[PDB]
Design a protein around this ligand. Sequence first.
Ligand SMILES: Nc1nc2c(ncn2[C@@H]2O[C@H](COP(=O)(O)OP(=O)(O)O)[C@@H](O)[C@H]2O)c(=O)[nH]1
Ligand SMILES: [Mg+2]
Length: 165
Amino acid sequence: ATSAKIVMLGESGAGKSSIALRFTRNEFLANQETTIGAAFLSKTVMIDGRALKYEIWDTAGLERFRSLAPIYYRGASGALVVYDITNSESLKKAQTWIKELRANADPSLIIVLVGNKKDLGSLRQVSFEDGQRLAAEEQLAAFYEASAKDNNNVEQVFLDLAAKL
Ligand SMILES: Nc1nc2c(ncn2[C@@H]2O[C@H](COP(=O)(O)OP(=O)(O)O)[C@@H](O)[C@H]2O)c(=O)[nH]1
Ligand SMILES: [Mg+2]
């Protein structure tokens, strides 16, 4: 297996931990304390060419302080910037995380935007096009809407990354 460090980013409550845990363990946990999610998760996948070990880094709740350590970002091949489609403020802050990620990691980083909790259709505050516009303005690698809870569109986010690595 060749390894790629992939970092989760985005506002508290967006679903970072739940996306990482859905992809790696095919589980979903409700109302978990922000500081208790595993900081480091992994899954090895057979892509075209090769076995790829995703080394997924999660925040351990430290984004509550609105900053993350240089070290978190350093050596990432990829980044998932997660917002909550039910929370317009979370999409505004996604753009802040994209600028921090660009300040701290390689210019070659693959950056993906993910609008999570699409299962909460009644509470939606931002449109698909809101997220697509941000991905266009910031020239990101990809944009998806997903549900960590229903396991809708999570696997695809990570497999599409492989390609670009
Ligand atoms: N309905 C729904 N709730 C979600 C989804 N993903 C996460 N959640 C919930 O949203 C809250 C925050 O999730 P968490 O993964 O801890 O977010 P983080 O702070 O970004 O790591 C938790 O209560 C989760 O159970 C989802 O896709 N849909
Ligand atoms: Mg978390």
